[PDB]
Symmetry: D2
């Protein structure tokens, strides 16, 4: 639409697109921060809407906001949560470091929509005010960190943790199914003493189980909310019960264990909970990178690599493309951790103003890890299968089973056999027969890989 | 649109949206890599289109592709470059690590559109073939690194370097304008011997000048193109002149100094040129972070900080919001460098398959630095002004001018004056008068900051 | 000057006055990279690991009492600082730590031989592989030593220093609870809070960091020993893994347990990647606290100047009052180091293959360095800076009362003029005849503005 | 056992058998953080800086010939390794490097006093501040020493080792130019190339890295000396900055110049942030080369096994043929270290304020460590691995000919069956009667497939 609606603030008049619900502050931000393409993610927009919905409810309970306005604001917020207003949030990540401009974006959109819900219009004549009504009892300084933690905790609980549990279950099933398949070990990339494919996969399972615990340990701190600290942490001008009531209301409407932060100065001056929680996510990235690499190396071939397992072929030579997407996003999480650490280390005095960047990286890492585990699970892990003949060919051509001979012929003769096999390019069996130290039936009876794995 | 068009590949039939120009391979990728929200940026899509346009021209020159098909492919590519097909590229960054799927996305879109341009239709009956025609003489393995370098070099030359030069010129103007304004120095955050505001800003200018040289040094390696190496670097099945001809054609159509990579094995197996070029960008980020911090600290106040300069107020208390956006994106560049380094270190054998991730980070850093410099320049740097009275108040209340007394009254008496001023909370002048060591006219004649800056 | 020792590769000259053997000698020839060596914490953890293995092997009837006791006595000498010059190998060695495992095997074997009345070298009465390395692989020994060193350093160095610094700052927060100062957001003047409130944020940060570090300890307490070469424990006694973790717990007084999955324990450094995540969180918190201290102390006349800190370095007689915040500089520098070390650890931890992670010397070098830096940095910052933080009460009150933020206290009773004309709020108000010299003193109470 | 020295803060006991003075003593009391100290390269660069300043001060008539010569002789003793135990200070000190500047001032002053027939301490004939530090500030001395150390280490250590390794790999590439092997993309079998071609990629990587490192040298050659406290050079001779850069260029034989903008030189570590960018590029290239070597050598029976590498460590007699790629492990570990060090450097370089960057000891600690790691790592990898790379020709040909990739050679004349039935291409073809035992040998020529 070309038509505009004129709005005015202390700097003068500014035109806003007539078909949009935002106002003068959003327009000024969008015009002054034309930096790259990254915007607030939907998860954060929704968390801001939840925050305003909870504040409106508490302000009504406390007699500070009328029933008619509070109900209209909550209904507008529910429309945002239902996906009806995604194009009303145009602002860049690369904005004011407190997130003030996105706070005001939500205030303006909810106020103008609430006005319409009460039979009014958008703009200067609206029936609901962005600051006096939608932002009542609030500061950008406590709202934005609250929305950051709401988005982070819900994404961890609802997306990442369920996908981690699902992938863990799949690999545990595979570990049990392949518990009796002996294969060659590899240490330093060199052939080593055997273990079962089930045992090797059980290591991946144990990694994912440990990662789940580390992530779970990070959740209580992310559940602490800044809301009620207002501008500098003192809560100046708020009702004494407001901070607890709004955390309680957020806990009710999200079904997640939000609590008010015990120290609002820590809550405003730092992003420490997210620095710590992201530490657990970069741990998960290091574990997934290792699992993904084992899978693609074990499946390498079809003739000039390892080839011990097969994986689903999802494209019409076929490459381990799910493993590649996963290893790439694991690198991304490691970079994101550095950006988060720099922002988290850079607070000054009463406020950390690196917040849009910190939450952009944090929520990206959660999407990448959650969706990457989901994709790797359904398009790779559920279909891993052993190549039993290839596994046995490698085991039987290795030199590593020679220790099974020690109890029968002694260490010196076993070592002589292995040295001859290596020097002359023979199997252990062929070298042993060539020296006359045993018969083929003896070799087959004594060299039992299933007895060498514990 | 709900209606579909059925296409078939070696895996069977797959439905594609009837209103889209992509084909079966793009559809399979979009369905198997539903990971997060990051997609190929427009710059990379355009670079892929340029690559196909150049290949079509050379294939025609060499008698390998008909005039009618080559001309139609070039016209379709020009439509992409003109912004007519942005919604035809739906694939995630988090795809196959070679970028094969985005290569095929461009092949399918250009083939189907070229078919329409020749009076045909989209789909199985198209008059132009994605592989046999649009991908003729090519592999994903050489196309994708070529598009990466085309996008990177053009973004550096056309966006980042011009914005760097513009910001440098603005700060040089400010340095000259303020060359005679003496202010207090600060080392370790402590008051120190004086320098002019122009001298301090000249440091920022010299930083940006040095950064431009470092960036310029990185351009020749990025200008080397993999195209012609085909699958593993040998160029098997290509015309002997093809590699040089296609680099020449890209140089002509872009007006940039592209050349064929002297070693195609390096060109396919690594992202080394981008690892090195991004090293220069993280240098720029460290310099910009320092400049932005000096600006916001020098402007801090209005009464309880430093307050030596004023900056434009762009929002209706006013915060240094351009400095905050810039410091945040500088942190992002540092994280992006780590992701790039991990991907660049992780090639195996004939191909690096961390490429979508590397180019996603690299092009993001270029957008952030280019657009951030542009925004900081027009919304902050051009309007920096001294607060002359505040500068003089700080200089006159400091203890640091006391050395101007040494030549007149001797070091011992000057040190006694400074010690008394510090202990008793006095100005140097008041302490000197209290001791009877000089008159007020003598102090004003001897303590000349304009004589203490070289 | 030399004796001739032997390994599977042939004869090699070894310094006669050293206790190491052929494999350590060869390592010195092949890994001449930079200057970083195993830190004392890791050497001690390796000695403890060998001491525990010797005891368990004796209990299981696998090693004679005379040899096991001599090995344990030699290990005690290492722990007592008597053999620091016997461990010359670089960090930048085989990625499993094999070379340092053999360094400890050879030193302990040769010293144990002497304790039994024998000599060092080929004729020794105790053997590095057959006796000191019995039941063990480098593959499970090195990760065990890594976790022993890490857990003990966290419990004995880092956590005590963190608690000590937290207590100091808690005392300062209580002492300054009534001192009202100007808030700062975006570096700009903002509404008031007390100095005690601001310091309470630092305290709460350190309290939260302690909890995060404590949550990382159970995983680090899991030990690989008993997994042997690939995790199966092939050729080891079924009770050995549990027994050796129990013995390490006894001799160290720390809650070590055998790792429930030896494949995870051998194939990854995951416990240390996670624990270092908590340490980089502490680094980000300490960076912020140290920056607040140095900015609040900036001056003495052209910065903020709200607090004073101890002056520990001599100055120039002609620049009295220039006090560089040198403890804050050491601390911010080491916090930057911890962030870099985290990246190095993450790359190594992401890079295991199959049955073994072979980035281990580098991972533990970084991890133990971060622990020393954070522990010693917190000790130094506490003793030489934090304990001496004091308010500059006159300066605090000058900034608070000359600011424009207190104007909000006039809302319920009835600024641009003060700002544009360079006046105080009271001077601008009286000039407008909107109140008096008693109403302003009555209505504008900063101590009522921190609730 | 002790002597009593004095600074502006009072009297302090100093070890009688040491050459440092009061300020170094105080630093030892206040900066007891970890174990990292100034590296020898930096101590030497500081001594060279003082040697040059003494000569220029003498030329300008500011320092007596007898004192200047004695200072220069004391500096030469430091450079000759006679005073390594006189520099005890931690990296984790004042962020300008003041403490280490004073350490060198005190050691040189006390030794110069002895050379003039005097004593060390209060009665010394040469003064640390008035004589050894004349015309200087810690603020411009420390960045000068940083750049002197960095440029000389790049020119004398790193670049020669890079050239040596490149030459070795170039020889290998030429020697193996005719050995056709299977390509691998995505870890999967792919069309052929020669072993020489694959190695030529490693060579081209190292050649490109050399150019990038060379491009970083001009900025590192710019010296801060002469900017004094804040960059203005207040109270220094107008020719001093140029003269002292010229003298450093003469005595080091390297192209040092005075920095054209002293404010940039004091307020940033930008030249080192940029130069380290090129070093992390080299680390990413060396990681890839080292990984190719160890994967190509993997086996001896259940990996790739296309090349052999030297066996440098003794093995078990019962595991002949297990050759761990230990040089590749040391090299990949140190490459991970360089990546972490880059982050630490970037944070320090981004963190200057106003006239001075005070993250300097940490920045130079990381930078010089990366140089040692890369230089010594390239030396070790060259001598103990790269020079001995050899093809396993039978294994290379077995993998090449049993693969499915060569089927494309049949296009212009006329695979699924071979793959599904476990046959060679020739066996599957003959079975289908699509060619013979002579046509296949004629049409499928891998040596014609690398053009």
């Amino acid at each position: 639409m070309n038509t505009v609606r004129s709005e005015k603030d202390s700097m003068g008049a500014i035109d806003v697109p007539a078909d949009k619900l935002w106002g003068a502050q959003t327009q000024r931000s969008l015009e002054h921060f034309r930096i790259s393409t990254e915007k607030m993610p939907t998860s954060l927009i929704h968390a801001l809407a939840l925050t305003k919905r909870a504040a409106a409810k508490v302000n009504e309970d406390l007699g500070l906001l009328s029933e008619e306005k509070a109900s209209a604001i909550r209904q507008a917020a529910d429309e945002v949560l239902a996906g009806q207003h995604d194009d009303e949030f145009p602002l860049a990540i690369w904005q004011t470091g407190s997130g003030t401009q996105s706070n005001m974006n939500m205030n303006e959109v909810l106020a103008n929509r609430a006005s319409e819900l009460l039979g009014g219009v958008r703009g200067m004549e609206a029936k609901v005010h962005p600051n006096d009504d939608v932002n009542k009892s609030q500061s950008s300084n406590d709202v934005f960190p609250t929305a950051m933690h709401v988005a982070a905790l819900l994404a961890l609980r609802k997306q990442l943790i369920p996908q981690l549990k699902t992938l863990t279950q799949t690999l545990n099933e595979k570990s049990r199914a392949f518990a009796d398949i002996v294969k060659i070990g590899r240490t330093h990339l060199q052939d080593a003493t055997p273990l079962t494919l089930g045992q090797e996969i059980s290591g991946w399972v144990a990694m994912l189980e440990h990662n789940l615990k580390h992530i779970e340990y990070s959740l209580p701190h992310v559940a602490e909310l800044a809301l009620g600290g207002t501008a500098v942490g003192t809560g100046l001008n708020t009702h004494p019960e407001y901070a607890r009531r709004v955390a309680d209301e957020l806990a009710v409407i999200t079904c997640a264990p939000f609590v008010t932060a015990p120290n609002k100065f820590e809550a405003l001056a730092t992003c420490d909970a997210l620095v710590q929680a992201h530490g657990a996510l970069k741990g998960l990235a290091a574990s997934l990178m290792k699992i993904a690499n084992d899978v693609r190396w074990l499946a390498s071939g079809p003739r000039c690599g390892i080839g011990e397992i097969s994986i689903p072929e999802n494209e019409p030579k076929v490459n381990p493309t799910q493993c590649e997407a996963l290893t790439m996003l694991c690198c991304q999480v490691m970079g994101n951790d550095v950006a988060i650490n720099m922002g988290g280390a850079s607070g000054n005095f009463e406020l950390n103003v690196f917040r849009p960047m910190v939450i952009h990286n944090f929520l990206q890492s959660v999407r990448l890890l959650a969706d990457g585990m989901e994709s790797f699970n359904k398009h790779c892990a559920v279909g891993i299968e052993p190549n039993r003949e290839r596994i046995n060919q490698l085991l039987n051509e290795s030199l590593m089973l020679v220790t099974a001979l020690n109890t029968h012929i002694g260490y010196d003769k076993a070592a002589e056999i292995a040295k001859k096999a290596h020097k002359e390019g023979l199997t252990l069996k062929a070298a042993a027969l060539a020296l006359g130290y045993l018969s083929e039936a003896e070799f087959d009876s004594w060299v039992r890989p299933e007895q060498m794995v514990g």
